[PDB]
Design a protein around this nucleic acid. Structure first.
Ligand SMILES: [Mg+2]
Lengths: 1319, 351, 156, 150
RNA sequence: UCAGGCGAUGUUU
DNA sequence: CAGCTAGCCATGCACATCGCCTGGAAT
DNA sequence: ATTCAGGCATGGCTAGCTG
């Protein structure tokens, strides 16, 4: 079955893979994030509640009084999106806060002396998000980019090779929290464990270890293990677990039970350990050689002496042995060490330690942190107790905690926001263990450690900063409390909050200017994932491997969409099906797999979880019952790819589209092109300029419907019904019966958006697409937008094209275009510029806006009015005057059109600062807008009342009808009559009270709108009135522009030939564009050729239908013929059948076909050659896809037949007249008397350093001289030069440059003395 | 510099000098009360650090910032770096009398001339036009002159044709690597708005036609014209100074052309006949009674300068291909014949 | 991990292959690259790109073979001492179930299935560095242990 | 088909215990490379001289008139390498590690590509672009230094 | 009219 | 008293273009 | 309406350890 508004033009479809999860709403990221930001929610949990419940309550210095929170509430804007775009304010909202102040007694329990609650104190303003996911700051339309940065947590890195050139890799460990300071751990070639706090100098980590109030004994107990010796009257013999002999070679003979077991100095097998454990004996004698290498653990003291007998972390010697023996100590503690298992790194660090105690350690850290400061007890105490343990300057996230326990093999996933001694100790354990050999490093690029923020999160952070500043202030003031008389408005000052949030939404590395010139360009700019920004890396001072794709981007980041040039890999576009996991990772869908069936249940997966399982590639031939037709299958397990078995896989791809982005899924026959050109193709397609008449691209990809419908430029309906009224302004929809609410039933109204301005100077326009009396269903197109049609997305147009060199004019890539194009206006574009004149008020006199102007004739003046502003519709040209402005002295400063553009004046705006008289014209425009608004809202009320009376009438027919008594009295008041004792009377009263409410509403809205328009709105200080004028140029096409394909072949149109000369075909038609064949094998993009063929087939079916219809036939022929045209292939999805199209819709279907039978092609499942061939055969063209031609000039036949077909082409907005430029003698900069730079500033080019090298290379000298002396620098030079040129005498006079004179002065500024010399 | 609004664009040197002068005046005031010496020590330390900032902000410890976050610029930066005076305003200066536009092909040109658009010209040579105007006596002063050249009346276009006729110009492309990167041409006026440029140079410029941009330049003085003509005119560069191979190598379509024009099948129309001369060869191929390639015995005559710098003729009956004979009518007097009796790939035409 | 032990015939063959690559193969691709460079575009061209790729791939091979030829310990030992199975020897082995195999044991570079294709570092050989005709010998496959028996030996 | 049979034989020998890990690695990669070369020669012979026609006698072959072979043999654009990547399999593809991957791309731009293959080719191209950038930088710096000494 | 931010277009393994 | 010698700073990083945006807080 | 926290390569240098 099909929607009714799809039956208009049913799109033929190739493809095999049955799809199961339709494309989701393409703007989830923006809208869901922001909604999450601002919404009433209990129990905190990521809202304004979070910030507040974090900062509040705020308590005095035990001043028996304290401030706290209750509830927040927004209001509603004073303005709205349209008015706002016109005026310039931000689309903002009020913000009210209910606070409560309380007071206790002095010297009592917490008894409340008195409390008050200020009525929702005002504070600040936060912008909202337009229904299309865009913000509005200052007459513009900005966007915030989701940011991709490193997750909070612990990380272990190698840094292999390059360092120290020693071949011995290193291992470092980092802790990065979400708001605080850094912390590291790392080794050195001398095998010592060092620490650094915040990239500063280095220390031995034992310093902070014992700064956690630990003794050396405890430290050793933590890290190493114990080995014991005791007094067995000789050598104080040992007990040992044979496990500690793992893969070793004893330095002394292993004896037991008087029996030797292993030779003295040999390796030991595990059978030895087995048999000796079966023996279960540990008491053993040892020699002295095995002793000295050990190190004492604890410190022994004696009865009488108790002096420095043994210092912990010290090796052994026979004299020490005798000393401790003669003092009589039973136990002897040592350190079980090794080389391949347990490196005594901590002991070496201890021996390197210069410190002795907690005090000295704190002193050392305090000294290294802030250089040049008096060491002090409390200073160090409070400092180091404020870098890893307090809410003040340090906090992880729940996310941080989750990652941080996960990488430590812990049990739970919820803890505190702070660190712990236990935590740091465990981190160091992990690092040591990694050094030992077990465990592995974890690379960074794996998406299990990147993370995606969004608008909501960043807004929350900045707003938090605001709140902490304001609490600093509140604490400060409240430290000087009063007698109950202050109220919570003096206790608050939102100006810093406003400052912070304005700064963020206005000027930051993320909030940027939306590229709005093409629906696709929007919807692929909003879904952008950026690696830059505060909190991330830089453009060129950033790493390398991050600029690379990783085997886990799959289905979470496009491979093939990114701008080339200075920053690749940093601006990854976000995948199609990608979502945002709760914690904030990139999750993608998959299909669950049971024992032997590809079940129809989706399931979302994260990054890390993906690694453990095994995943089946998409295009795998199943058979109707989940059974894989083979027993082996291509799949991926862990960045791998390999044929696997049958009963092993557990998840299968959702569809095939999921490896690209919307920015590059519109590329038909994509899979047949290389990577490079696919890339450049997506990018160029993003820059398409709209047109004046869109025409439904032929070879499409089925991903157009969503890309258009959801990118909210077209106007989607909301409640399906019957179209009642159409007009280029508005659309009026009557609702169906049962999709209705009881009260305010009425009908829906849509105000379209007529000719107005983009941000790239393009024409955003809308057009109706239905006719009176035509049903429409929920969620459907009603208004086509810029470059849309009937719902589908269209960018350029489709043209007949033929590949063959033709007299040079297509030498390198120069497309050629025949006048048959520039006649029908099928590339004409519309642009709109916007010009601004201002009225400053400078001392020596205010400005004037009069018509009277000195030293100008009636010529320019005629177009002006009697007030000084051009009429609404004159056809001004370059140089004329739009607004008359003069500055007293009186001098001319009027406003003139920039040189070059033609155009027409479509609209004028006037702003006036209050407190100043108005002219005649502003008054007239005021009265115009008043009249129009009044009429508009009056029509609102009238049609709404009309619908409501109609509903009344419809109701009265049921239950108490009076068909004759109803139309006795007029439409005035049909509620004058009565109804029985039924709920229908209740309904009548509902309708009546709604009518009265609408009356009052109309009254109030009228008055309020009048008051809105009447006043003179605020402005930047120091201005009087602004006049704005629009223009509308109509640039057509001309040699120099840039037309492009989609597969990625550029071109610069180069000649416009007359109709005759284009190579025609034997049937008689001309051909319109002639590219260059040699371009195809070079840029390996074989695709556009297949595209051409398939298009040829399309237009074949088209022309066939057109003939069958023009020779008007019985409809049954069309029925059969369309049926055939739609079946034509192997197993597919489409399965349409026109046996159920009412014998009239069919005709309208043919109508909309006669230009072509649009074919679709999913990306990696597209049509194959055989079906193309058979479609062409259904047409009448030759199978080979090539036709003979006939050249126009000679009128004879080319040889070796060539290719023709329709290749949908686009136009880019690098038009020629925005690049042609020239300067003779214009302005001059002020510091260094040189010509300016750029075009808008009427300047000249730049004669580059390397060019000076070139000119030196040739012997040319005089050219160089006057190239950098007469035409640039010497003031006297160019004056003389000009005066001489005007009279034939070509001759320069060099003089000295002036920038050099400046160089002299700036060096002389210093202690230096530089001079010229004797002549 | 004043900005739009009751403010002023803050510079850096201003702020720095102002800081120094504040600190100096404070210290001067302090040497009257004879305050305790720790104060004056802190004072002198501030002043030393400030003068340090003024001379080189960024060589002591943490550099002083300015408005928002960044080290305000000091004299050391005025001279240093990729943006001081040297590499920005003394080795390459912006220059008047110029312009820029987009390029296209236009193969109807002899390789010592290049297109140019009217509007660009009439904006460039404004002085010359003024001069020739008041020479031919059409306006008294410069005022009416400029008014005429803006209104764009009739006679100006003829005047412009007369003043461009033999006045070379320079074309430049952006990444200028080797001294080919700037060549000369003579203009020929075109309509439209995009420079037309001969094909056989788009290899030396390393410039495709995918939307690149080129800059013009106009010599002013007379020595300059003669330089541009006797040294930089395009005819006088047929060899890259890197190495003696030619640089006028025909590039990418013309080669396919000559290729398909000279080759041989085994059997096509008109095979097995004899032709008195390349003339009637071309005549056959136009009339359409003989294929474009079919092996034929023909007569040809060739010249050779084996004498003391003197040309001598000899003729014979070669065996060749009709198209190849057609190519023969272009070779100048002096070559041998075997140079064009094979496939003619790219290396062949190069040598 | 490796063993510089190589047989002299393969040594010569490898040296000859080196000479072949460095004399009559490199220069042709060289000429192709020198040609393709004279074209205008380089980022809009792929012929230069893929021909350069060919150069990289052949360079890697020549580097590897060079380091090898530097570090090749040659033992062109005769059948002088025979009786065990230590190196460069033909070996028949049979299963207790019917599976038979014939092979010669050589160094790492001589394994391309043609005549003598088994490397010493393989567990098979590692279990056979010296044996006697008519003896059991077991190995540890990833699917468990195995067993065979020797049949005959002929050095050369 | 025969290539797949061979890798199957080698996999059998591995799980039978005659080779090591990197041993299997190199064995497989070599036999695929050999197959690649065979395919290349096959296509080149099937194009360059494929035309065979009558002479007014029976038959005699000659150099062909296939458009792509002309556009290559002339010297205009593209060569044996590109016509390879349009007809035969497009060889092997390294990965960012540099470790060359162990399954060739048995497809070609005329027929289609399943996803993984296109993905890997993306690897290659992106690394190429990044190197273009940095290399440009160093080249410019070298040129400047040289011109300031001579 | 100067300084910065951002984005974009070219040449560029 | 001399020869390293490892560890810590200075300085360097292509060219050309176009468009948009914003330039002190407290008293 | 005045005023005060992801680079690399290289070279040069300085404490600091063996004879
Ligand atoms: Mg280009």
């Amino acid at each position: 079955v099909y929607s009714y508004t799809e039956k208009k033009r049913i799109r033929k479809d190739f493809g095999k893979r049955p799809q199961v999860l339709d494309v989701p709403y393409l703007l989830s990221i923006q809208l869901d994030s922001f909604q999450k930001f601002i919404e009433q929610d209990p129990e905190g949990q990521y809202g304004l509640e979070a910030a507040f419940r974090s900062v509040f309550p705020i308590q005095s210095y035990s001043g028996n009084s304290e401030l706290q929170y209750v509830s927040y509430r927004l209001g509603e804007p004073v303005f709205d999106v349209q008015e706002c775009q016109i005026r310039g304010v931000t689309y903002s909202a009020p913000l009210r806060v209910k606070l409560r102040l309380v007071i206790y007694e002095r010297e009592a329990p917490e008894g409340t002396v008195k409390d008050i609650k200020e009525q929702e104190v005002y504070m600040g303003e936060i912008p909202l998000m337009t229904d299309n996911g865009t913000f509005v700051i200052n007459g513009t339309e900005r966007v915030i980019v989701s940011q991709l940065h490193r997750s909070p947590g612990v990380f272990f890195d190698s840094d292999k090779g390059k360092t120290h050139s020693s071949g011995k890799v290193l291992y470092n460990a980092r802790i990065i929290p979400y708001r605080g300071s850094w912390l590291d751990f790392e080794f050195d070639p001398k095998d010592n464990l060092f620490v650094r706090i915040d990239r500063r100098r280095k220390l031995p980590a034992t310093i902070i270890l014992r700064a956690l109030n630990y003794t050396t004994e405890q430290i050793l107990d933590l890290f190493f293990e114990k080995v014991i010796f005791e007094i067995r009257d000789n050598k104080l013999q040992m007990e040992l677990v044979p496990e500690r002999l793992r893969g070793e070679t004893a330095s002394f003979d292993i004896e037991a039970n008087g029996k030797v077991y292993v030779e003295k100095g040999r390796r030991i097998t595990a059978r030895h350990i087995r048999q000796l454990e079966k023996d279960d004996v540990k008491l053993i004698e040892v020699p002295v050689e095995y002793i000295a290498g050990k190190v004492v653990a604890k410190d022994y003291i004696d009865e009488s002496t108790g002096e420095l007998i043994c210092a912990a972390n010290m090796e052994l010697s026979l004299d020490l042995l005798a000393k401790l023996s003669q003092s009589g100590h039973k136990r002897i503690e040592t350190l079980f060490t090794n080389d391949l298992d347990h490196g005594p790194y901590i002991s070496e660090t201890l021996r390197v330690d210069p410190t002795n105690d907690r005090l000295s350690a704190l002193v050392e850290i305090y000294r290294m942190m802030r250089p040049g400061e008096p060491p002090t007890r409390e200073a160090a105490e409070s400092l180091f107790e404020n870098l890893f343990f307090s809410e003040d300057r340090y906090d992880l996230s729940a996310v941080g905690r989750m990652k941080f326990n996960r990488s430590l093999l812990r049990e739970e996933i919820e803890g505190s926001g702070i660190l712990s001694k236990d935590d740091i100790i465990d981190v160091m354990k992990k690092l040591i263990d990694i050094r030992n050999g077990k465990g592995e490093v974890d690379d960074i690029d794996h998406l299990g450690n990147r993370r995606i923020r969004s608008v909501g999160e960043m807004a929350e952070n900045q707003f938090r900063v605001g709140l902490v500043r304001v609490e600093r202030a509140v604490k400060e003031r409240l430290s000087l409390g009063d007698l109950d008389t202050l109220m919570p408005q003096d206790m608050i000052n939102a100006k810093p909050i406003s400052a912070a949030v304005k700064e963020f939404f206005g000027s930051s590395q993320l909030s940027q200017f939306m590229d709005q010139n093409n629906p696709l360009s929007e919807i692929t700019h909003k879904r952008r994932i950026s690696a830059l920004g505060p909190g991330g890396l830089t453009r060129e001072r950033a790493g390398f491997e991050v600029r690379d794709v990783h085997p886990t981007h799959y289905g979470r980041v496009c491979p093939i969409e990114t701008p080339e040039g200075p920053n690749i890999g940093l601006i990854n576009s976000l995948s199609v099906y990608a979502q945002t996991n709760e914690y904030g990772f990139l999750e993608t869908p998959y299909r669950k797999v049971t024992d032997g069936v590809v079940t129809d249940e989706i399931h979302y997966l994260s990054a890390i979880e993906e690694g453990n399982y095994v995943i089946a590639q998409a295009n795998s031939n199943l058979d109707e019952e989940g059974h894989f037709v083979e027993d082996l299958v291509t799949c991926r397990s862990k960045g791998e790819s390999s044929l696997f078995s049958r009963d092993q896989v557990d998840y299968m791809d959702v569809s095939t589209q999921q490896v690209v982005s919307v920015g590059a899924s519109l590329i038909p026959f994509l899979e047949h092109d290389d990577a490079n050109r696919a890339l450049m193709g997506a990018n160029m397609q993003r820059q398409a300029v709209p047109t004046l008449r869109a025409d439904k691209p032929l070879v499409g990809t089925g991903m157009e419907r969503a890309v258009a419908v959801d990118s909210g430029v077209t106007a989607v309906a909301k409640r399906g019904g019957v179209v009642q009224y159409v007009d280029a302004s508005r659309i009026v929809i009557k609702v169906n019966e049962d999709e209705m609410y009881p009260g305010e039933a009425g009908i829906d109204i849509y105000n379209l958006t007529k000719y107005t301005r983009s941000n790239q100077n393009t024409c955003i326009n809308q057009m109706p697409c239905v006719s009176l009396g035509e049903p429409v269903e929920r969620g459907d197109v009603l208004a086509d937008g810029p470059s849309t049609d009937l719902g589908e997305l269209a960018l350029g147009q489709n043209m007949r094209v033929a590949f063959m060199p033709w007299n040079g004019y297509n030498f390198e890539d120069s497309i050629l275009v025949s006048e048959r194009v520039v006649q029908e206006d099928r590339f004409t574009t519309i642009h709109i510029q916007e010009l601004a004149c201002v009225s400053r008020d400078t001392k020596l006199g205010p400005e004037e806006i009069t018509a009277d102007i000195p030293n100008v004739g009636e010529a320019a003046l005629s177009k002006l009015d009697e007030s000084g502003i051009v009429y609404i519709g004159a056809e001004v040209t370059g140089g004329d005057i739009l607004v008359g402005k003069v500055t007293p002295k009186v001098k001319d400063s009027s406003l003139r059109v920039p040189n070059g553009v033609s155009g027409t004046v479509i609209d004028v705006q006037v702003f006036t600062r209050d407190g100043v008289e108005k002219d005649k014209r502003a008054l007239e425009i005021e009265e115009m807008q008043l009249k129009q608004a009044k009429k508009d809202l009056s029509e609102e009320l009238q049609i709404l009342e009309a619908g409501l009376f109609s509903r009344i009438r419809a109701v009265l027919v049921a239950g108490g009808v009076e068909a004759e008594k109803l139309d006795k009295l007029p439409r005035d008041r049909w509620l004058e009559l009565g109804l029985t004792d039924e709920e229908k009377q209740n309904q009548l009263e509902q309708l009546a009270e709604q009518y009265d409410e609408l009356k009052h509403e109309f009254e109030k809205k009228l008055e309020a709108k009048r008051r809105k328009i009447t006043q003179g709105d605020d402005l930047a200080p120091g201005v009087l009135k602004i006049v704005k004028v629009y223009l509308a140029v109509k640039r057509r096409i001309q040699p120099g522009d840039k037309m492009a394909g989609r597969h990625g072949n550029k071109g610069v149109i180069s000649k416009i030939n007359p109709i005759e000369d284009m190579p025609y075909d034997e049937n008689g038609t001309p051909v319109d564009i002639v590219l260059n064949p040699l371009g195809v094998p070079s840029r390996m993009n074989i695709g556009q050729i297949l595209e051409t063929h398939l298009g040829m087939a399309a237009k074949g079916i088209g022309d066939k239908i057109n003939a069958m219809l023009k020779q008007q036939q019985e409809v049954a022929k069309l029925r059969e013929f369309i049926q055939r045209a739609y079946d034509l292939g192997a197993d597919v999805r489409q399965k349409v059948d026109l046996s159920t199209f009412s014998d009239e819709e069919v005709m309208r279907l043919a109508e909309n076909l006669r230009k072509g039978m649009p074919i679709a092609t999913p990306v990696f499942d597209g049509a194959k050659e055989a079906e193309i061939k058979e479609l062409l055969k259904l047409g009448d063209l030759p199978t080979s896809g090539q036709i003979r031609l006939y050249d126009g000039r000679t009128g004879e036949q080319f040889e070796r037949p060539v290719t023709v077909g329709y290749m949908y082409m686009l136009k880019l907005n690098h038009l020629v007249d925005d690049k042609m430029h020239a300067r003779s003698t214009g302005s001059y900069s002020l510091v260094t008397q040189q010509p300016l730079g750029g075009k808008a500033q009427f300047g000249g080019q730049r004669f580059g350093e390397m060019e000076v090298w070139a000119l030196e290379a040739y012997g040319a000298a005089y050219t160089l001289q006057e190239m950098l002396t007469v035409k640039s620098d010497d003031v006297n030079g160019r004056t003389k030069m000009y005066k001489n040129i005007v009279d034939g005498n070509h001759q320069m006079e060099p003089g000295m440059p002036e920038s050099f004179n400046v160089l002299l002065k700036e060096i002389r500024s210093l202690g230096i003395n530089i001079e010229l010399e004797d002549e | 510099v004043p900005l739009d609004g009751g403010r002023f664009a803050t510079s850096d040197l201003n702020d720095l000098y102002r800081r120094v002068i504040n600190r100096n005046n404070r210290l001067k005031r302090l040497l009257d009360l004879a305050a305790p010496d720790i104060i004056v020590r802190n004072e002198k330390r501030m002043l030393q650090e400030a003068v340090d900032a003024l001379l080189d902000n960024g060589r002591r410890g943490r550099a002083i910032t300015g408005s928002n976050k960044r080290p305000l610029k000091s004299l050391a930066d005025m001279i240093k770096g990729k943006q001081g005076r040297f590499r920005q305003n003394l080795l390459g200066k912006r220059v008047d009398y110029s312009g820029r536009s987009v390029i296209t092909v236009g193969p109807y040109l002899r390789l010592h001339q290049c297109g140019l658009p009217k509007k660009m010209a009439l904006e460039l040579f404004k002085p010359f036009i003024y001069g020739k105007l008041e020479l031919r006596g059409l306006a008294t002063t410069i005022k009416a002159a400029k008014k005429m050249v803006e209104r764009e009346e009739a006679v100006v276009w003829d005047i412009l044709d007369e003043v461009i006729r033999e006045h070379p110009v320079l074309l430049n492309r952006a990444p200028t690597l080797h001294r080919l990167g700037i060549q000369a041409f003579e203009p020929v006026l075109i309509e439209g708005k995009a420079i037309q440029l001969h094909p056989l140079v788009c290899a030396a410029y390393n410039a495709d036609f995918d939307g690149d941009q080129m800059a013009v330049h106009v010599p002013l003085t007379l020595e300059a014209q003669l330089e541009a003509r006797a040294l930089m005119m395009s005819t006088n560069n047929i060899l890259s100074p890197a190495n003696g191979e030619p640089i006028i190598v025909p590039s990418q379509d013309v080669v396919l052309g000559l290729y398909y024009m000279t080759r041989d099948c085994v059997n096509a129309k008109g095979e097995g006949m004899v032709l008195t001369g390349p003339k009637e060869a071309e005549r056959l191929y136009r009339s359409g009674l003989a294929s474009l390639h079919a092996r034929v015995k023909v007569r040809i005559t060739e010249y050779e300068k084996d004498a003391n710098g003197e040309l001598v003729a000899k003729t014979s009956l070669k065996d060749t291909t009709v198209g190849r004979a057609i190519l023969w009518m272009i070779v100048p007097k002096g070559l041998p014949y075997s140079i064009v009796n094979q496939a003619l790939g790219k290396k062949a035409i190069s040598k | 991990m490796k063993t510089p032990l190589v047989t002299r015939e393969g040594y010569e063959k490898l040296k000859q292959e080196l000479n072949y690559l460095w004399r009559e193969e490199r220069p042709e691709v060289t000429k192709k690259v020198t040609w393709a460079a004279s074209l205008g575009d380089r980022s809009e061209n792929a012929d230069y790109q893929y021909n350069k790729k060919r150069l990289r791939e052949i360079d890697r091979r020549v580097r590897y073979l060079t380091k090898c030829m530097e570090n090749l310990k040659i033992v062109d030992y005769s059948p002088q001492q025979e009786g065990k199975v230590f190196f460069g020897a033909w070996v028949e082995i049979e299963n207790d179930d019917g599976v038979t195999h014939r092979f010669r044991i050589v160094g790492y570079d001589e394994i391309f299935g043609r005549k003598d294709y088994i490397s010493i570092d393989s567990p098979m050989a590692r279990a056979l560095l010296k044996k006697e005709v008519g003896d059991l010998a077991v190995v540890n496959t990833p699917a468990g242990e195995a067993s065979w028996y020797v049949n005959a030996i002929e050095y050369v | 088909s025969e290539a797949e049979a061979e890798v199957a034989e080698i996999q059998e020998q591995f799980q039978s215990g005659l080779v090591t890990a990197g041993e299997r690695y190199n064995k497989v990669i070599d036999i695929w490379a050999a197959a690649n070369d065979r395919v290349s020669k096959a296509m080149m012979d099937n194009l360059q001289t494929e035309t065979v026609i009558n002479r007014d006698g029976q038959e005699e072959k000659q150099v062909s008139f296939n458009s792509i072979y002309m556009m290559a043999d002339s010297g205009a654009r593209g060569s044996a390498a590109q016509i390879r990547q349009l007809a035969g399999m497009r060889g092997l593809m390294a990965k960012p590690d540099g470790s060359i991957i162990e399954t060739p791309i048995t497809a070609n731009f005329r027929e289609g590509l399943n996803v993984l293959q296109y993905f890997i080719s993306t690897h290659g191209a992106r690394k190429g672009l990044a190197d273009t950038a940095l290399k440009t930088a160093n080249s410019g710096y070298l040129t400047r230094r040289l011109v300031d000494v001579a």
